[PDB]
Design a protein around this ligand. Sequence first.
Ligand SMILES: CCCCCCCCCCCCCC(=O)SCCNC(=O)CCNC(=O)[C@H](O)C(C)(C)COP(=O)(O)OP(=O)(O)OC[C@H]1O[C@@H](n2cnc3c(N)ncnc32)[C@@H](O)[C@@H]1OP(=O)(O)O
Ligand SMILES: CCCCCCCCCCCCCC(=O)SCCNC(=O)CCNC(=O)[C@H](O)C(C)(C)COP(=O)(O)OP(=O)(O)OC[C@H]1O[C@@H](n2cnc3c(N)ncnc32)[C@@H](O)[C@@H]1OP(=O)(O)O
Lengths: 223, 223
Amino acid sequence: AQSPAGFAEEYIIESIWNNRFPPGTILPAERELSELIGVTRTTLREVLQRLARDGWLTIQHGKPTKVNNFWETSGLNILETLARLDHESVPQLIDNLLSVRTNISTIFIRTAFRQHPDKAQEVLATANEVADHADAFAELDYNIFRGLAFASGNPIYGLILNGMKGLYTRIGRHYFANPEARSLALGFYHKLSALCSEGAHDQVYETVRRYGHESGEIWHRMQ
Amino acid sequence: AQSPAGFAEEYIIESIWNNRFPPGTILPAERELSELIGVTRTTLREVLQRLARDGWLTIQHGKPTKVNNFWETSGLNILETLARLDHESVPQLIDNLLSVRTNISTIFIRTAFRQHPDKAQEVLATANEVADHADAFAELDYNIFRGLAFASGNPIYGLILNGMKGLYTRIGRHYFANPEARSLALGFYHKLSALCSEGAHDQVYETVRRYGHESGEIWHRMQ
Ligand SMILES: CCCCCCCCCCCCCC(=O)SCCNC(=O)CCNC(=O)[C@H](O)C(C)(C)COP(=O)(O)OP(=O)(O)OC[C@H]1O[C@@H](n2cnc3c(N)ncnc32)[C@@H](O)[C@@H]1OP(=O)(O)O
Ligand SMILES: CCCCCCCCCCCCCC(=O)SCCNC(=O)CCNC(=O)[C@H](O)C(C)(C)COP(=O)(O)OP(=O)(O)OC[C@H]1O[C@@H](n2cnc3c(N)ncnc32)[C@@H](O)[C@@H]1OP(=O)(O)O
């Protein structure tokens, strides 16, 4: 089911990870690499292009190809790669990701309440008739955080969130299987609507942080 | 100098923008599209793959290709595309981007001071012997914000920042041409070092916001 290009890409990535190709070193020449992996030169060129695009490698025409430290070259889209290939960083990464979600959402949620309260309420209202199951909630939660990011009026927040949908719902489907996770979330969306209704922009920060800690307790107990 | 693939990609993107291909509609069939643009079917397939990857289109094997609203599908890497092709959103987007930079840096800078103060100081010290010119400062500024993002211990902040280097230094080279922009920045890095030295984690938020407003005044006067 895995194409030769797919096999080649995965082999190079894992080789960087296990250090066959340590970050900061150059990749063996293409003939050698293609013979080692078992793919044509055309297949290898295409795979190197994709890996360079995702920040794993730096390529320059007519020059050796360097292995990067992806931590300083890659963007958010590698999160799904680390996940797919089961990197060791995954567990702590989701915690890091949820911490980031909590903290930057304190920013755009407050802005959304100040700038476009009606849109924010519209987004929050979607929680009203949601089905009581994991799948419905993972979907709902993603749309509420993203909808509020969009409602801030600063689209950069939405672009940040845009790629995690799959990963996002993934963590969410596991998390929202717990009815208590679903209840805390409904309480959270309801309190956000109230705060936006009351124009209590100042209370957003502590409310979101509190939901971060508590949802954190539930998540950790689970996992 | 522009390849046929490059011409094809740019033509489709601009067509979405000027609405020849409105978001939510499907793209004309491939034979028609390739004849319209003047590229082979192979070239078009490769270009559609790239556009789908960047979120402009949604493709599904054996199904019509849909034109997306990139605002809800694309990630941060499209910022350089909007820039390259001169979208109308560009001017306000950089303001949005600088607002985001200010607000999320309040988060990771404070965390960096609390978690890895030595690394944070090391990063800030790089300002000490920097050359007094636009290029040196744009480079320095990017490395200090990213270095502090890395020093927070949460690598997600670094991944967010990682792609803007080119765009980042671009805005920075224009901004730091002004000696006053360079002076305010040095004052800012020096004050951050002092705060980290004093363990005054609580003052990070207002200091960064203040630098955001003031650097904002300089930038706007310029532009
Ligand atoms: C926008 C970018 C894209 C990210 C979005 C995509 C992510 C996919 C979304 C997943 C699907 C949604 C389903 C869910 O709702 S799961 C949500 C479960 N919550 C959760 O896992 C906790 C998230 N963490 C947080 O919200 C914050 O980390 C805390 C509020 C808990 C803490 O704030 P921080 O700023 O990060 O650190 P601080 O120094 O204040 O406090 C440290 C203290 O906090 C605890 N802690 C618990 N979980 C933590 C994470 N993830 N990071 C850091 N600390 C975390 C303590 O263990 C810690 O130390 P202490 O000894 O003092 O308790
Ligand atoms: C991490 C994600 C990737 C982003 C990094 C890549 C970006 C490339 C980096 C560019 C290279 C660096 C060179 C430079 O140092 S240029 C820096 C110049 N500063 C600057 O342009 C101002 C940045 N804006 C801000 O810092 C904040 O917006 C403010 C502190 C000014 C305001 O905070 P916000 O939260 O955004 O809004 P708030 O409601 O509190 O205040 C609104 C008030 O602020 C003014 N304002 C000025 N510039 C503004 C931007 N960019 N957005 C929003 N408001 C901005 C006012 O006009 C506004 O209304 P008021 O009538 O009340 O004054």
